[PDB]
Subunit: 493 residues, 4 copies
RNA sequence: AAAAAAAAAAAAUUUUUUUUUUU
């Protein structure tokens, strides 16, 4: 049986888990505090125009809107200046939220989701039915109901008159968009990203789930209320309390599976593992073998490990809510039939979450390419931050290589015109290497580039990958002692 | 030109420059550069038409029948040729393929002063005319033993016949002396020369289109002229010249900023785009970024020209970094196919100047191009960096309260165990501050619900956000040790 | 009203206080574990003899010998010039600990056992010692006591108004306790202990109990139970009516407002009603007090009044701290002597209220008053603090350049030695920064003038400003160890 | 031979040492910080008046007040009970700094300037003071001097045997200099500086240089040049024959083996030839010395060790330039005549100082009291700073005893009305002890003083001695995380 | 963290989780 388990015993992160008996199928965790860095909707103004235009919506860095995402409601496709004009105001949704010095990515194609159908108020072309005899007769119902709309899997077999029930809520909710836009305040939006209940059921709750188990009565009562508000008050019969002495997720033994969604590596029943590495623009998965078993059949070892990997990779894609481009390095399979079998097993595992996923065949190099629909940012870089030490490179520069580089950087600052001093402020061991092993070269710099003071400072506040070299121009000289330079710069910077 | 910087002995830097464009580079330090394509002793550890060799590498090396000479037989199975626990002397033919150990060969060869001993025949093609027709007269007198082969080396030109008629005995002794080495030395250990990394740097790079070699250290210049003259090419020594300026050689040609582009994560491009290079456990991903959109840019010219510059730059970085194994490149999306193809063939032509094998796929639907590069030596990422000690190479660290709540639910499951009297968590200061104040209610909840078990949470000065410990105290083996003493114990117990 | 207040709700320190209304009168705080050097009576073995020291060293059960001077041996142990005329090796003696825990050294010992009761002290090994406390019909009551012949006794101030028949009760317990000691001492094997630190009432009442105490208030019922039992065992079950529990939400010591007064016993400086203060500094051998006036705004009347208030508070701190040994005071200078003596007599009157003996000399030529106090137990300074690991108890740290230049010439003076190849200094970050930038010219001057010696200076994370190390490397001891590896070496090697 | 050795090879401290053969005799070390509180003569403005103190406060141009008691005001400033009968605000006086930099409190001043030459000291504002050295032609020569009326003079130790004509040379410079003082004083504005502690060459000799010193050795030629110039202006140009350079590769102080003796002036403890030692501790108002024995005949060893200690204590009193009250535990001696012998050994060792020194007898408790004149701040005041860790107490409170005191301070704050939270910011081991060993009591406080939160924060930036406990009033609560509270309070307060 | 054994709990009574055990 499929079951949904909700853990809310500690309010600082609400955990919702979808389970197949004892196997965790899907996960969402949202916290109050920090900043909840996903999927917000905003009201904003066009501020600069060029394959995109830039929107001021009250964020500290502007949003980015490309030509693909410009709705017809802007119009008066070579240049955006032929489509847009300054000071024009629209509601937009963030895909990627204010990362670094790049703007937050936007769309104007907001969509409103119901119990049976999703409404596309800005796009009359977009419509369809989620992936036979059911689809086609539902498409006749859909066709009978500037808007477009899509019908959810929970709409399977619903009549053209039941769908007319749910659509009345959706069109009220479009009136709520129009109230938000010209009735309500300048930064305002419709019912927000912060809702605990609606988004949690509506994205993933489907009828073959047998029970919802909840550990907090005060949350369970609001769940009853919202599932009744979502039009399913009969389905409230499935909501049940939990009371057991082991906490709910350790009671069903999904606790380690949940934390596997944060792990870099997941091990597999045959003893192989999948390793997930995220890069600038793609997520790379590498699959690792178990022991060779003293001349076992390496084809079935690879093929079975790849299959158990495909079963796990589709699941991690769900659990992490990954999006954008992915690359998979499966173990090398000689015959084509093994390659096909892994490709189609992956397809059959990933289609059962509703998010659009697209897959290539295995290349000559053994690399498979796939993509996943951009529904929200992953757990990575929403419950994580960029590593302050290595700046997110994942590597530290080797101590002698850095020391010798700083030595020649000092030399190249001291070569400059108008130069009176150079200060290198460095980690303690870097200073130790410079001022003993390379002291002969620091003296060589001070004597060749004659007249420049060279100061090398060991800093308490630095560790290997961070250093500063600074130059002092004529008349900027100071009596400040060498050990006082970091104390100055903690205030000065 | 070829520019050699060695004014600092702690790393030897060799650069190849075209005009003032650095086009190829090598930087490795002594003391942890490995000279040869090394020869090692190893143990036959698993067998099937190959055997697997423990030569001290982290994953065993591969010894196929392709590279086993019949003199190593005691032909369907190596199980019938070799046995478990057998000790073999073998050479690295290919160095650390991807995840795997080295591929290995038994065809060891020893280089003498006229010849290379194959304990096969011919002469160096590089010697000509009246040289070959005297060198053949020096060869024909040599007393090489039965069943051994030879190659007459380029170094053989001008060497006198009556010294080297004896000198061939050293290589014939050295083939037996390998036995002495193999039973005196430990197994994962080195063997004599054939691998001077400064002279052999010419073997990697020096061919006739190079006009000059400029060397800023006079002793390295002395050793270079000595080697190129000893290799029998004293005419070619006319290319080797000193540098003497007070600005260092690489700043004199203004390549010093270009060299460190081989170490940066990101290199910016003349059109204002950039390439970003990331390494994963088995492949390298490159992303190409446009310039910030400004003042009426043209969308196809921006994408296409930035990609073409990025293709030239990527081929250049591939050389500079000495990357190897699989690569994936995400170019900027180009609408018309001929622009895509033109970028592919620009990359192909740029990389064909490399002497390494490089192979390239077509651009996929997603805008991803796949390629390979030959596994010639460790990259700059392997020689000059190590994995981040904080994050262990993720490049991102969990948010403090999120990691705290993960540690809290681990503590809760440790307290649920049988045979348990206390649970100790040792954590970074902010984790303890959060758990022992914000989540104090939960710590009390664990201590009261999982009845009878003590919970200790210790703030440690010695920890950063990624690392923590949670531990078990057995019933009756409990200790009176104070909370702040537990890290002082565990830094020295384990 | 005088009260005794006990706070025992937190076991990691038991607090016993005497209060005069809301004014704290006397205090002890001791932490748990009855670690036993108090007044211990032992059977011990004579293990070394030193007539040069005039002492014997006794193995009484401790891991380090106890010290028994010739001053402290009763004639019963003789076979007064030499220990060799008075004791011999392997002799067994009965002894009592007089002095607690000098340094690393064992306890000092006497053979003149004394047992102190509620009203009297019994001197069973000394017939000459006897009297009545000078703080006091009691001489007639004493003369009526049936004291055993050859013993002495002294009567306490607690004998005030007591009857000749109540005094015989205390005498009956104390002499029974000595008869038990004798039965134990001659039945039991030599290396053993006869009575010990651990009794709560013997510590509590004998240090504090007088009849004018109106109440004893206790906030822990397990203690109150044992208090009523012990005061009944003392034979005052009627006095158990004074023992009462405290139950308020404000803790006992904050209800009587003494909790702020207790912390004055820990401070270096204590403020006074006239706005002056007293500052207490303890040195190698004496405790010196300074008295300060208030801020400026008649200074002569202020000086005299502040000295008097300081004398009352100094006598009170001498109690609360349980100070012992020599004490020295700077009062504010008073012109007429009769005001100096008036302050001395205020001090005398404030210290007569201590039952520990105190002795005073007159105010000196330089305005120093010298006095001593009986070493009944280690003070709060000796028992509840440890020496500063940074300043080593000076209260001062050397200036960074003042230290750096001294290290600089220490490095030079090591480099001057013959047979020398390297010198290493390991020093704090700022000291290394000063040595290697400000004084780099001098470091180079040493390397060139004291030619042939390598000079290494290492900034250490694990050293503060006060400490440093400087070391010398002899001929051929040279090592490839990196500079920043030298501390890592010495933390593991030493 | 007695020698003066000057070491100047390193400019950051100039070292002047005086040696009796190879025994270090006297020392001064000064760093080139040209801070002039030292001893200079000034003109100042009467700025505050205190008949309560019988004193006045003077503006002499410093940011720190001068203190000028009626003890120190000459009758030339009057219009002896009250300063209001002597002074008014804005009156201008000639003054000299007597006391340097007590605490925050002002430098003490005198108007009774005295000018000290090479053979004599002139007392131009004081007729009463004059005579001949206690520690020593001269009876004729003194009477022959043409000393101006109303001035006094004192003959120096260096005046031994000096002629009736040499003394008239030195007198002429002193009476020149008093005119220069008055000319400056009545020409120039109100607060200003008249004359200088140009000590390094000239007065470094003149306060120190006696005819019995055989050589002056100098390692810096620029200093040697300035020495030979000044010794001629001092009127001893024949003595310029004695100024010599030192040139060896071993530095001057290590050649004469005094370098190891000098550091004894910085140490807490100094060793003695009999294997004993002396321990010097300085307190709020006095310096206490203790003498310790070696592990001989105990009565004879005590007496000999006390004598060797007296020799060294007199020498340390000079080398440290100690000042104020001194107290000594000598080892207790049975016969009294050994007590006076040590007392008078100490007297004879200190009578060699020109600083005023006074000694009492060994007291009842075996304590000897003495005093020494405050000629300048010691090496303890000039070349050390108060320990930052212990606040100069010399002890650290035990972690549990401090923890339990903080615990009950937290409880006593949480008892207060108008109180919403209590925050304690503490060192790591104190928080560790409070929140684990004493967690039951923290919970006890949170339950008894119900409604008030207790937060205990482990701080990176606090050592064992320091702590803060703070009170949060109604509505002052914050969502700021516990680990963020130190960052908040470092910026706010 | 590897073989066998015994206990507790969860989904369908056998793979899963924990703990412990090996002259
Ligand atoms: O030999 C003796 C005599 C009295 N004392 C103590 O001295 C105290 C004198 O002060 P009062 O009389 O309380 C007395 O109460 C005893 O506790 C000893 O310790 N030893
Ligand atoms: Zn990192
Ligand atoms: Zn200190």
């Amino acid at each position: 049986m499929k079951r949904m388990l909700i853990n809310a015993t500690q309010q600082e992160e609400l955990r919702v888990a979808l389970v197949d008996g004892q196997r965790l199928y899907d996960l969402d965790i949202e916290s109050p505090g920090h900043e909840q860095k996903k999927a917000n909707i905003y009201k904003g103004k066009i501020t600069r125009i060029e394959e995109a235009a830039f929107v001021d919506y009250g964020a500290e860095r502007h949003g980015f809107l490309p030509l693909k995402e410009i709705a017809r409601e802007y119009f008066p496709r070579p240049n955006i200046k032929d489509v847009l004009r300054e000071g024009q105001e629209v509601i937009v949704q963030i895909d990627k939220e204010e990362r670094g010095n790049k703007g937050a990515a936007l769309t104007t194609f907001i969509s409103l989701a119901g119990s049976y159908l999703v409404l596309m108020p800005n796009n009359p072309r977009a419509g369809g039915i989620s992936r036979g005899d059911d689809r086609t007769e539902l498409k006749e119902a859909l066709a009978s109901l500037g808007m477009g709309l899509i019908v959810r899997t929970a709409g399977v077999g619903k009549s053209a008159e039941a769908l007319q029930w749910d659509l009345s809520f959706r069109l009220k909710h479009w009136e709520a968009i129009k109230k938000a836009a010209e009735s309500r305040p300048a930064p305002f939006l419709i019912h927000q990203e912060s809702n605990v209940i609606v988004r949690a059921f509506r994205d993933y709750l489907r009828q073959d789930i047998g029970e919802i188990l909840i550990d907090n009565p005060k949350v369970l009562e609001l769940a009853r209320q919202h599932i009744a508000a979502l039009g399913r008050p009969d389905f409230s019969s499935k909501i049940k309390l939990y009371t057991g002495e082991i906490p709910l997720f350790s009671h069903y033994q999904i606790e380690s599976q949940i934390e596997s969604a944060f792990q870099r590596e997941v091990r597999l029943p045959s003893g192989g593992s999948i390793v997930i590495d995220s890069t600038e623009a793609l997520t790379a998965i590498r699959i690792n073998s178990a022991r060779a078993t003293r001349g076992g059949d390496i084809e079935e070892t690879a093929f079975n490990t790849n299959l158990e990997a495909a079963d796990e990779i589709a699941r991690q894609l769900r659990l992490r809510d990954l999006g954008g481009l992915i690359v998979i390095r499966f173990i090398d399979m000689t015959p084509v039939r093994h390659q096909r079998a892994v490709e189609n097993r992956l397809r059959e595992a990933v289609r059962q979450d509703r998010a659009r996923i697209q897959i290539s065949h295995i290349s000559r190099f053994g690399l498979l390419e796939m993509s996943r629909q951009r529904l929200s940012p992953s757990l990575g870089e929403s419950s994580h931050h960029v590593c302050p030490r290595c700046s997110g490179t994942g590597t530290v520069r080797d101590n002698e290589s850095l020391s010798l580089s700083i030595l020649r950087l000092i030399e190249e600052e001291a070569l400059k015109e108008n130069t009176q001093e150079v200060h290198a402020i460095v980690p303690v061991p870097i200073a130790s290497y410079l001022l003993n092993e390379k002291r002969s070269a620091v003296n060589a710099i001070e004597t060749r580039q004659d007249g420049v003071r060279c100061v090398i400072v060991p800093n308490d506040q630095m560790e290997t990958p961070h250093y500063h070299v600074l130059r002092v121009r004529k008349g900027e000289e100071t009596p400040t002692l060498s050990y006082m330079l970091p104390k100055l710069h903690e205030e000065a910077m």
